[PDB]
């Protein structure tokens, strides 16, 4: 199924996922497309930061859901 990830610049990324995908795997899919290391990524859905070992289904993230990608930043 597809989900969408909205980045800080307003770009929308489309990911191919399954409900059993872990947040860690989703972050690796985002790295594939945007080049951001997973350890820098904070994924937000329903106002909550998603934890790495959980699955999309654990958060009831269904087809055509949109997540926000925010970033850890340091500097110077």
């Amino acid at each position: 199924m597809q989900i969408f990830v909205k980045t800080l610049t307003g770009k929308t990324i489309t990911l191919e996922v399954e409900p059993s995908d872990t947040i860690e795997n989703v972050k690796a899919k985002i790295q594939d497309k945007e080049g951001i290391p997973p350890d820098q990524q904070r994924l937000i859905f329903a106002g909550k930061q998603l934890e790495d070992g959980r699955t999309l289904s654990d958060y009831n993230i269904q087809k055509e859901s949109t997540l926000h990608l925010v970033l850890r930043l340091r500097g110077x």
Binding site: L8, T9, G10, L71, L73, R74, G75, X76
Partner: peptide, 22 residues
């Protein structure tokens, strides 16, 4: 945020991290 990133419309400032420089 990062360069080109969205700022809250009510923010007075953007504190921008650009290639490890704030």
């Amino acid at each position: 945020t990062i360069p080109g990133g969205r700022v809250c419309p009510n923010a007075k400032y953007a504190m921008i991290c650009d290639k490890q420089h704030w």
